[PDB]
């Protein structure tokens, strides 16, 4: 690790600076270095890690979608042969995306998840594990595609089971997990009905628990609830 010689606290400080500078590749590298110090992550540190890699892989996914769209058009009946270049470059971006996903999954497996005992950490990491297998699933086409999908499903399911036992229905981690698992059902698992049911039930159970919250907790929970509603509006 090229960050092995830097202090943990300095890595966290520089991740925050990288965020302010919108340098998310740097942010992710700094947070990878911090994870590799071997200590558990605090709540803020977990979110720094997630924000960094979500931004990096989000950009890769957007680029992949553009290139995949161009590639599909090049393969329509009537197109002029473009040669191998569109496929090659889509494959290049795809391989870089898979590499980032494998890196994050590696951090979760070595050894963030196994040391995470509190619900807020364990559900958060298992959600990430489902998310990064979901991104692998988005580009998967080979002998392993069903297994990648099932790895995402299994991680999300363990996270769901813990969240329903250990967190209130308005907990923003629980809500964000349900939001993303619902998208998994709709976009990956070809289960739109499950996606819609999960989003609606999550929204309604949260609604009924808002009365217990402070003004600031209310703002956090209703923000994610609105994303659930947004998706439901998209899908119905």
């Amino acid at each position: 690790g090229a960050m092995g010689s830097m202090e943990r606290a300095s890595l966290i400080q520089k991740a925050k600076l990288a965020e302010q500078a919108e340098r998310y590749e740097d942010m992710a590298a700094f947070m990878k270095g911090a994870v590799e110090k071997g200590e558990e992550l605090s709540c803020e540190e977990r979110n720094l890690l997630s924000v960094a890699y979500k931004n990096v892989v989000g950009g890769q996914r957007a680029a992949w979608r553009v290139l995949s769209s161009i590639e599909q058009k090049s393969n329509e009946e009537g197109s002029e042969e473009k040669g191998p270049e569109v496929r090659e470059y889509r494959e290049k971006v795809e391989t870089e995306l898979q590499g980032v996903c494998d890196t994050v999954l590696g951090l979760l497996d070595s050894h963030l998840i196994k040391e995470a005992g509190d619900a807020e950490s364990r559900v958060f990491y298992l959600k990430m594990k489902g998310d990064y297998y979901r991104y692998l699933a988005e580009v998967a086409t080979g002998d392993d595609k069903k297994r990648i999908i099932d790895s995402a499903r299994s991680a999300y399911q363990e996270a769901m089971d813990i969240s329903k036992k250990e967190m209130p229905p308005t907990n923003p981690i629980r809500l964000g997990l349900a939001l993303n698992f619902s998208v998994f059902h709709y976009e990956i698992a070809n289960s739109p009905e499950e996606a819609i049911s999960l989003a609606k039930t999550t929204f309604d159970e949260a609604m009924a628990d808002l009365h217990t919250l402070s003004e600031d907790s209310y703002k956090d929970s209703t923000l994610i609830m609105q994303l659930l509603r947004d998706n439901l509006t998209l899908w119905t």
Partner: peptide, 5 residues
């Protein structure tokens, strides 16, 4: 695309 967080 749908919203995720």
């Amino acid at each position: 695309f749908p919203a995720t967080v």
